Amino acid sequence: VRLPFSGFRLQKVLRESARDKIIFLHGKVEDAVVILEKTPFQVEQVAQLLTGSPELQLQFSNIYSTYHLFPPRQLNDVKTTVVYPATEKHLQKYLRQDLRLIRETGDDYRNITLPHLESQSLSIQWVYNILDKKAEADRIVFENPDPSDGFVLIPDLKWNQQQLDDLYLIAICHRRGIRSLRDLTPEHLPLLRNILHQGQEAILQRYRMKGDHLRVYLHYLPSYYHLHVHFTALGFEAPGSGVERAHLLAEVIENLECDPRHYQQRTLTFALRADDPLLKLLQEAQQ
Amino acid sequence: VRLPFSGFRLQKVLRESARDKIIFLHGKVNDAVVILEKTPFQVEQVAQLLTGSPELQLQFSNDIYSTYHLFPPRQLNDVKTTVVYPATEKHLQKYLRQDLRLIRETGDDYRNITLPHLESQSLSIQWVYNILDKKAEADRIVFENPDPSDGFVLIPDLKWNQQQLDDLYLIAICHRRGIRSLRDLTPEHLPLLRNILHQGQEAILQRYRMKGDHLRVYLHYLPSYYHLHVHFTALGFEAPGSGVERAHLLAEVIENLECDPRHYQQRTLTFALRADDPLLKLLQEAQQ
Numbered sequence: 155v156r157l158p159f160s161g162f163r164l165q166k167v168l169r170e171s172a173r174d175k176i177i178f179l180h181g182k183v184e185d186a187v188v189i190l191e192k193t194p195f196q197v198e199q200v201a202q203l204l205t206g207s208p209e210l211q212l213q214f215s216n217i218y219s220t221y222h223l224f225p226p227r228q229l230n231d232v233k234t235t236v237v238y239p240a241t242e243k244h245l246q247k248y249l250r251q252d253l254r255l256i257r258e259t260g261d262d263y264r265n266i267t268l269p270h271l272e273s274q275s276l277s278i279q280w281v282y283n284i285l286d287k288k289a290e291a292d293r294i295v296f297e298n299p300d301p302s303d304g305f306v307l308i309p310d311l312k313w314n315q316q317q318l319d320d321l322y323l324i325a326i327c328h329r330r331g332i333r334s335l336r337d338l339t340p341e342h343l344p345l346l347r348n349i350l351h352q353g354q355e356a357i358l359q360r361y362r363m364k365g366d367h368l369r370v371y372l373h374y375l376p377s378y379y380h381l382h383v384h385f386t387a388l389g390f391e392a393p394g395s396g397v398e399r400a401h402l403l404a405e406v407i408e409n410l411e412c413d414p415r416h417y418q419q420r421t422l423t424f425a426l427r428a429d430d431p432l433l434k435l436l437q438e439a440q441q
Numbered sequence: 442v443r444l445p446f447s448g449f450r451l452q453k454v455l456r457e458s459a460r461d462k463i464i465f466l467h468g469k470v471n472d473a474v475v476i477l478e479k480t481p482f483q484v485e486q487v488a489q490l491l492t493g494s495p496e497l498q499l500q501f502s503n504d505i506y507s508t509y510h511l512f513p514p515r516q517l518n519d520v521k522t523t524v525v526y527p528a529t530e531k532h533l534q535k536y537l538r539q540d541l542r543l544i545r546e547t548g549d550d551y552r553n554i555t556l557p558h559l560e561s562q563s564l565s566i567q568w569v570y571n572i573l574d575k576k577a578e579a580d581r582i583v584f585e586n587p588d589p590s591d592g593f594v595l596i597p598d599l600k601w602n603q604q605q606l607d608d609l610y611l612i613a614i615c616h617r618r619g620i621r622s623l624r625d626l627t628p629e630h631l632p633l634l635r636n637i638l639h640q641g642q643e644a645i646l647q648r649y650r651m652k653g654d655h656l657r658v659y660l661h662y663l664p665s666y667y668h669l670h671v672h673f674t675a676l677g678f679e680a681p682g683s684g685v686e687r688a689h690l691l692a693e694v695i696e697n698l699e700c701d702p703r704h705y706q707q708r709t710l711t712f713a714l715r716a717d718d719p720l721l722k723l724l725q726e727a728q729q
């Protein structure tokens with residue numbers, strides 16, 4: 155299959171991680187962002203390769219010997235995400251900037267964060283497309299169609315589905331208007347309970363993965379402002395599973411049962427890119 | 442050019458890292474360990490490939506977004522192959538990771554199951570005492586508040602080589618004895634916690650010229666040793682332990698104790714345990 159465009163002219167390498175074996179490239183085609191990621195190893199096809207005669211070229215020796223391996227097509231998979239046409243929100247996002255941590259009080263959110271957010275963030279159209287089945291229908295793992303307490307559990311774009319090691323699914327709620335953790339009140343408890351339980355039971359049916367192998371969380375300062383819950387394999391150090399962003403659903407539910415006004419009043423901690431205008435707005439508000 | 446042995450029989454997958462695109466395999470030969478790692482991308486070769494006609498297979502398409510499966514030529518298909526032959530059990534022990542299971546411990550679970558289990562296994566924290574009474578690692582103290590109750594000792598963690606700030610990792614050990622974990626914290630510990638957070642950070646700013654907003658300051662629930670200690674790490678340093686299933690931010694810990702005094706005695710804490718952990722079974726059995 156052909157790319158959604160014709161020809162690529164690299165403009166800038168937005169991000170280049172040697173540790174995560176990923177590259178984010180901005181190119182002119184019109185504007186387009188192409189993400190290439192080396193796929194994780196599949197135990198079966200590797201074990202099968204080592205039992206035979208592989209193509210190796212020695213780098214160095216010792217007991218420690220290093221080689222350069224050239225495996226056949228099957229092992230040569232690369233995850234290719236194409237964003238076309240890509241907006242200025244996309245080009246700024248993927249860029250590597252130093253991060254600074256900020257502690258947002260209930261008043262900081264009301265006065266600084268919420269008005270900034272309302273000034274606008276991103277199009278959520280792809281979310282709507284999933285929810286109204288205009289896209290990815292074939293990939294829905296489970297759906298509770300209830301307009302208020304309902305959701306859609308779909309594997310995330312970031313998971314190639316070839317192995318359970320990096321299992322990553324999202325529960326996207328059917329109800330519109332819940333931007334983040336900050337909009338949550340006790341009226342959202344039946345929705346959240348539905349996600350926690352029905353989302354895990356769906357993973358158990360589909361992937362035979364017990365709930366104690368799952369890390370179920372929300373992100374504070376999410377990438378998109380339509381409530382979504384992450385379901386990640388525990389052995390997977392999922393970028394974003396870190397304490398400065400992740401909030402366990404079970405704990406979110408429990409806090410809400412304890413303190414109804416919790417997420418509206420309490421101070422939330424998150425990181426922001428040094429170049430983020432919101433970071434300055436909060437910094438200035440705090441001094 | 443070839444292999445140091447003849448034939449491979451995979452017995453056990455020692456370690457996996459789907460984020461690092463690496464695999465650790467123990468296999469029987471002629472005992473050996475083969476490490477396979479996907480090689481990083483080369484901007485040039487990739488840019489050159491996208492300007493032409495690549496072999497792509499669509500996974501799906503949604504709005505402006507679309508995912509594919511790419512099969513590049515030989516030049517992009519390199520895999521780093523480290524071979525350890527012959528292999529011994531201590532290497533098999535340093536290279537094998539245990540399967541983890543998550544558990545949600547209620548206040549009552551801790552009181553009835555966790556605490557009695559902890560008390561059963563007589564664990565020595567003599568090395569901690571040695572630091573505190575300066576019998577060991579005196580030369581490493583970055584900062585010390587000597588107050589017997591509200592005081593602490595700030596020491597760089599031994600894994601941090603101190604040659605760069607990128608992986609800055611310090612630990613504060615409190616002078617006061619008897620605070621095993623997060624579960625022992627009450628509002629009486631607020632002056633100590635406030636000193637650890639504010640003094641610890643001020644010391645890091647003076648010593649390392651690292652502003653507080655570049656620091657992730659946390660506690661571990663189910664710590665490796667049961668004498669209260671807080672971690673001070675560089676924010677850009679993403680290395681497990683900073684994950685939500687274990688880390689608890691000191692600032693948040695303080696705020697919780699200001700709101701709910703009885704918080705850490707009553708509330709349900711979530712953490713992971715190694716599948717072979719006797720405590721994991723004890724909690725599982727208690728819960729059903």
Ligand SMILES: *S(=O)(=O)c1ccc(COc2cccc3nc(N)nc(N)c23)cc1
Nearest residue numbers: 189235237280308309310311312503506
């Ligand atoms: S990026 O290219 O890394 C990138 C951009 C946007 C998003 C938001 O997520 C999706 C966009 C479109 C479809 C989609 N479908 C599923 N199943 N899951 C997600 N997460 C997305 C992600 C990555």
